[PDB]
Design a protein around this ligand. Structure first.
Ligand SMILES: Nc1ncnc2c1ncn2[C@@H]1O[C@H](COP(=O)(O)OP(=O)(O)O)[C@@H](O)[C@H]1O
Ligand SMILES: Nc1snnc1-c1ccc(C(F)(F)F)cc1
Ligand SMILES: [Cl-]
Ligand SMILES: [Cl-]
Ligand SMILES: [Mg+2]
Ligand SMILES: [Mg+2]
Length: 265
């Protein structure tokens, strides 16, 4: 169906390990979108063809206001193209670097939107497993949208692919290569809440080996300015035993969230 000739390419929107994303406009409809370009050669080399198919299949059937749309795909002799919804206000990552840290109302609103989107995902037993600021985009009204479903699977699961970059957002069971389920996303939710309020993730360290150690032992402390309500929520989410982590309904109905968020469930 679609081919490259159907689109006019614009400015670079961002880069990932494999993804090279551009602003684009479809010629006949003038529809503005984001084009995610991947190189077949590096995809074959890393042997992650299965990750790309899972990304296309899972994301294209999901329909939720806080989840980025995937309209379609096409491919030539060298590249693969994903046709995505364009997010005009950029990443949460960039926004965090601008402001250094978010206030309690901004943080609570983001968490509510995340919890809403994850609740929808888990209802189909879809787990994301790669929730971090670079993969959270912002709509035209500043609303949060989850993207990059390249690591997503159906629960329960093991891990068959090599862990690439940072360990900062992964729970002990995933890092120790053990079996895991939906509760991995809730650990990540706890890591984000901390980083949103503090300015850096709770287990950050100088080396891979040390970050590994702090995560498996759950070693984190709060700065003085973090209030009692925030500490309660974060402490509940960062449990070593996954079955002790709260349900998403509990997060959405937490007194600190309900008092500070500006959006409903
Ligand atoms: N729909 C989009 N709108 C705006 N920017 C995007 C969009 N998709 C991706 N980007 C930018 O490109 C970067 C990489 O996209 P992503 O799909 O996460 O690539 P990868 O899967 O290689 O990590 C993101 O961090 C973001 O900054
Ligand atoms: N042809 C090659 S080579 N390496 N990956 C591919 C590939 C990966 C994903 C798809 C997709 F259909 F899911 F979109 C198609 C092709
Ligand atoms: Cl290109
Ligand atoms: Cl306190
Ligand atoms: Mg990404
Ligand atoms: Mg990816």
């Amino acid at each position: 169906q679609w081919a490259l000739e159907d689109f006019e390419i614009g400015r670079p929107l961002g880069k990932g390990k494999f993804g090279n994303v551009y602003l684009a406009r479809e010629k006949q409809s003038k529809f503005i979108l984001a084009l995610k370009v991947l190189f077949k050669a590096q995809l074959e080399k890393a042997g992650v063809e299965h990750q790309l198919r899972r990304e296309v299949e899972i994301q294209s059937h999901l329909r939720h206001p806080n989840i980025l749309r995937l309209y379609g795909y096409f491919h030539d002799a060298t590249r693969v193209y994903l046709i995505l919804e364009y997010a005009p206000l950029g990443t949460v990552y960039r926004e965090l670097q601008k402001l250094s840290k978010f206030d309690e109302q901004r943080t609570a609103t983001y968490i509510t939107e995340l919890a809403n989107a994850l609740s929808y995902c888990h209802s189909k037993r879809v787990i994301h497993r790669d929730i971090k600021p670079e993969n959270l985009l912002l709509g035209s009204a500043g609303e949060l949208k989850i993207a990059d479903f390249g690591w997503s699977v159906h629960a329960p699961s093991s891990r068959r692919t090599t862990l690439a970059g940072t360990l900062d957002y992964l729970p002990p069971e995933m890092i120790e290569g053990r079996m895991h389920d939906e509760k991995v996303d809730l650990w990540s939710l706890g890591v984000l809440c901390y980083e949103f309020l503090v300015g850096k993730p709770p287990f950050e360290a100088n080396t891979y080996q040390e970050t590994y150690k702090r995560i498996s032992r759950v070693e984190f402390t709060f700065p003085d300015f973090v209030t009692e309500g925030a500490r309660d929520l974060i402490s509940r989410l960062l449990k070593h035993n996954p079955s002790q982590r709260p349900m998403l309904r509990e997060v959405l109905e937490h007194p600190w969230i309900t008092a500070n968020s500006s959006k409903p469930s």
